[PDB]
Design a protein around this ligand. Structure first.
Ligand SMILES: [Tb+3]
Length: 168
């Protein structure tokens, strides 16, 4: 049956993802004490192909282990909340929502596309691209305590890559 793992996520500026009420996630730097606030995700490996390869990011004409990319589809649930991140059109732009779901039926191998993210990993850094809306990515703001959102801009001020910590 469908493979899954539990994990926390931090954006590339070390902001942890936490619940900001039941209806959204927010990102902020957590002092070691409040680290317990981190939302635990349940990442399941859904239907679709895994790709891998190398891109020559340091431009030396060769490949190195830190240039090996992986691309694999996943769904992101919130451990024991029967909620899934999902991408939907709201007021005409791709939007990130937390969607409640029937525990009986989830998770499954064949996720509806709104739930599917292409997890792209290179040198232990992660992007989560929307399968429904390509070129849109799970993103955080530079500022503190702002919502996690779906953003179609890379390299600007918004953060679009993360690291993952595996949880027991
Ligand atoms: Tb190289």
């Amino acid at each position: 049956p469908v493979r899954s793992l539990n994990c926390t996520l931090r954006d590339s500026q070390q902001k942890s993802l936490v619940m900001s009420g039941p209806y959204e996630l927010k990102a902020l730097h957590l002092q070691g004490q409040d680290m317990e606030q981190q939302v635990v995700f349940s990442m399941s490996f859904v239907q679709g192909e895994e790709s891998n390869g190398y891109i020559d990011t340091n431009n030396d004409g060769w490949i190195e282990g830190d240039e090996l990319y992986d691309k694999i589809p996943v769904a992101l649930g919130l451990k024991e909340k029967n909620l899934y991140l999902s991408c939907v059109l709201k007021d005409d732009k791709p939007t990130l929502q937390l969607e409640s779901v029937d525990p009986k039926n989830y998770p499954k191998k064949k996720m509806e596309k709104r739930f599917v993210f292409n997890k792209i990993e290179i040198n232990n850094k992660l992007e989560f691209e929307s399968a429904q809306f390509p070129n849109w990515y799970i993103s955080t703001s530079q500022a503190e305590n702002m919502p996690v959102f779906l953003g179609g801009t890379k390299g600007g001020q918004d953060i679009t890559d993360f690291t993952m910590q595996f949880v027991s």
